[PDB]
Structure of DNA polymerase lambda:
Amino acid sequence: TNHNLHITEKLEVLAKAYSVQGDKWRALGYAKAINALKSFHKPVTSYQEACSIPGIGKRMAEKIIEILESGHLRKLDHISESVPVLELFSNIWGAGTKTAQMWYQQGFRSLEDIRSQASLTTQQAIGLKHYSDFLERMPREEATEIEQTVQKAAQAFNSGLLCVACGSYRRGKATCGDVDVLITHPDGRSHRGIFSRLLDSLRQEGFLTDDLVSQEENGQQQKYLGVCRLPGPGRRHRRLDIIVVPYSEFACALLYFTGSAHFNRSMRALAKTKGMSLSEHALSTAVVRNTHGCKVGPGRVLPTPTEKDVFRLLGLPYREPAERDW
DNA sequence: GCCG
DNA sequence: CAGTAA
DNA sequence: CGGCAGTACTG
Ligand SMILES: O=c1ccn([C@H]2C[C@H](O)[C@@H](COP(=O)(O)NP(=O)(O)OP(=O)(O)O)O2)c(=O)[nH]1
Ligand code: NA
Ligand code: NA
């Protein structure tokens, strides 16, 4: 359906350069425009037409028309030579633009440089060991197998636990970057202490191979981010994210964890225009903010038993997970 | 970068 | 806290 | 001019 491939391919290069150099708001603008172009019904053929599309302004319009007339984009030719190396480094899990830029300034140019000379955090060393694996997407059928491994282990010590795979899986994608498993209990209390029992059970059977984020000390753990691998030959290491939530938060946690990320941001932005606030925990009304958009007063939580309730309270038509890519 |  | 991530 | 989402770990 992308009727503007020659344009977007060039804009994506520029967008990625801004992102990895840390100019996140400018990169957000490019991401907004690129999506608007991927979804326009026709080839965009004029400056006046390009401007009419939400997310495209005068500046983006004159880049589009430069591409159309000449097949090239002058700005690409002056992208810093550092950008491919910065992208290489920031694809290490646990390293972002700041770390990538420091490693670059220190003279490193390759993952061999990083391995042999760089200071690495515990997470980054795991990211580097699984560098290729964390860039691959698994078939969704393997995500099912991972969800079932987690569900069988959780339900072995409490059969009442509800487990649901979210993210790209629940949105129906053919491949998945990780598996996002949401766990809750329909009664309202038994979700306490389950992380400790769950993670121990998945470690005893050899399924978890490394931990990236897991605060197991004080019992208030909300998320586990780590690495798993199914048994047998031909298996890769896969990213696993688990969250455990109170039942009263199930609809908002499901909404958050199904995403997409841009869908969540657009929904939360709409809530803010209404004096409301939407998080993974709750939809709140009568939220008080200052002129900068920052919360200065808490509001009150609205009951949201189902995802449909959240849309309804925001004045929105319900959208099925497969329709939430943007 | 866009846009209110 | 800054950095990174979901 | 200035916001662009709202959260949870790490050290
Ligand atoms: O910045 C973010 C990132 C993720 N999220 C939510 C939405 C996202 O779908 C969910 C899971 O995050 P993932 O990184 O797993 N993204 P997703 O599952 O959609 O795609 P994939 O895992 O296949 O890359 O967390 C946000 O709200 N903000
Ligand atoms: Na990274
Ligand atoms: Na995911």
Q: What stands out?
A: Residues 184 and 250 of chain A are 7 Å apart (CA to CA).
